[PDB]
Ligand binder design. Sequence first.
Ligand SMILES: CC[C@@H]1[C@@H]2CN(C(=O)[C@H](C(C)(C)C)NC(=O)O[C@@H]3C[C@H]3CCCCC(F)(F)c3nc4ccc(OC)cc4nc3O2)[C@@H]1C(=O)N[C@]1(C(=O)NS(=O)(=O)C2(C)CC2)C[C@H]1C(F)F
Ligand SMILES: [Zn+2]
Length: 191
Amino acid sequence: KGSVVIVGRINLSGDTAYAQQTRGEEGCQETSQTGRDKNQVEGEVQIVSTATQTFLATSINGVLWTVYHGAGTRTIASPKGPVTQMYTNVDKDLVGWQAPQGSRSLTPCTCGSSDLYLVTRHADVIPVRRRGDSRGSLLSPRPISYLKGSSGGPLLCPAGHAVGIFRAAVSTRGVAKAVQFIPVESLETTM
Ligand SMILES: CC[C@@H]1[C@@H]2CN(C(=O)[C@H](C(C)(C)C)NC(=O)O[C@@H]3C[C@H]3CCCCC(F)(F)c3nc4ccc(OC)cc4nc3O2)[C@@H]1C(=O)N[C@]1(C(=O)NS(=O)(=O)C2(C)CC2)C[C@H]1C(F)F
Ligand SMILES: [Zn+2]
């Protein structure tokens, strides 16, 4: 199987969040096969792809994290070739690689706030009220299509710290009313 490939990023650096593509589909396929990706990486949230799926990955504390259901055990492409996972936990649906040079990491949240914000692959910033250790409700439910492809993205607190990694959606008749996430403390213990 090929490597996971960074194909874009969610730009959160200014006042407006927006998605940027950094590699098209043909270059993605080539880079997945070689594992050699010379592109410059920037930012906290990467858009990533395999031959068959596309999703997100988020840097927290120097590790680029994503979901096992997207990445499996795959290496990630890098300027020096394929990079093997540093963390794999199928029970948490969690994998991680060393964060690429040029990326910026989020800091784990320590404030205990329940007012969260989910960042999607389309750079929507979606308010979510935390409802448990691993769940939160959308303030404005929407069709699940709007969340598809955003696993591996972050939930952030009002100060912009990482609270969790988006894992699964709670859906009724195709409407997403809530999200399920890997809490950052689960990452912190993994580290
Ligand atoms: C494969 C898709 C996974 C499945 C089902 N699933 C759901 O969300 C389902 C739907 C389908 C009914 C919505 N809800 C749901 O279980 O709710 C229940 C309350 C939750 C409690 C159970 C949590 C289960 C889990 F998550 F831990 C999970 N652990 C796994 C571990 C190992 C593994 O090894 C192969 C597969 C695993 N598979 C898992 O879950 C996930 C999903 O779709 N995630 C999102 C996404 O965007 N993926 S993605 O980027 O498009 C893609 C596919 C390209 C990568 C955010 C969703 C976006 F769509 F909203
Ligand atoms: Zn916080």
